[PDB]
Amino acid sequence: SFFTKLTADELWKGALAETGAGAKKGRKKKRKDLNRGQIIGEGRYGFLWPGLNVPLMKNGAVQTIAQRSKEEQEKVEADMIQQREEWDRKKKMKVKRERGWSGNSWGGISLGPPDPGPCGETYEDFDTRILEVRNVFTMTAKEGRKKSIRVLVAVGNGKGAAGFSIGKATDRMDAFRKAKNRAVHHLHYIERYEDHTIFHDISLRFKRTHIKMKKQPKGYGLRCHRAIITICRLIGIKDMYAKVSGSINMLSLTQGLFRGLSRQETHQQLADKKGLHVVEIREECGPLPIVVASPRGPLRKDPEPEDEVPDVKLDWEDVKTAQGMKRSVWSNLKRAAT
């Protein structure tokens, strides 16, 4: 019967069942366009109506109602099938997504530069990296086990400016937008020795996460936890070692790493603080000292005590490595370039 016919929108609504009791709590098909591959005035009988589906005027005169031959209509049908197949293939193809720390993990995936600011500010120089994605839930009075996405993103320009932000949203893309927009307003500046590494060894314990970062020479690479590698790439650090101990909660690690890197003291700051030259001894350069930093104010005449035995607390792991007793099979493995 004709009078029971409905519209494509209502039919797809009924078919796909996009809404329903199941979808509320997650207790397969997708929409298709059945009007794209049609030209108004084309039917199975292959009639050619002047002015609608064939040009109205031919030889400067109105064309007549025509009909394609049987074989010509079959040719048109084959062409339509071919166009349908081409569209189907263009839908079948998939994006060759670059994978992060693992094929199905968001960590390390790049979200691109943060959106331009309301005042026209542009952060095209910046890059955003996802460090974590949690599907946090929370029981509600009526909605029950609500689902939300907690995202952590680090934004950096590879020139010492880098920050991180948490993102809460029901939609993953919304969380990405929120986090990568909120991070740019929370940028730190990380001082880099020679623009490739930290200025000194950093030992810290943020909450229950211990971070031990060792300054390293040029070309040593990033031998660090993967999140630390991502954050170092964002900052602009190329050579550094880093060991994480205790709880390795990603947010705790990120916050502690940024705190330590921000709190590091530059060579110039040390020179000003102690009123003395800062001298660097490079083995490749022999005994030739290199004055890396010198004080701005009056250089002290006091030679500073030459302590016979320091009282600094030593890391047992570092002492063990220096003595060579550490037999860890996993230590100093050959790994891809970082």
Binding site: G117, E121, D125, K159, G160, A161, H185, L187, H188, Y189
Partner: protein
């Protein structure tokens, strides 16, 4: 943009660092005035803390 990390460094330090990094395209109106006439104490944040042991406020009685 700026750096809303008010607990990290001072406003001057953050602004100077971002300007050096190029994040801030132009210095703020107050930057040069501050640099010329910095305050006696850098406005670095500092969490207050109660004195627990034998430590006491070094405030003398005016007699």
């Amino acid at each position: 943009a700026g750096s809303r990390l008010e607990t990290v460094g001072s406003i001057f330090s953050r602004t100077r660092d971002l300007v050096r990094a190029g994040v801030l395209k132009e210095k703020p109106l107050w930057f040069d005035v501050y640099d010329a006439f910095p305050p006696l104490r850098e406005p670095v944040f500092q969490r207050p803390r109660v004195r627990y042991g034998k430590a006491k406020a070094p405030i003398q009685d005016i007699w």
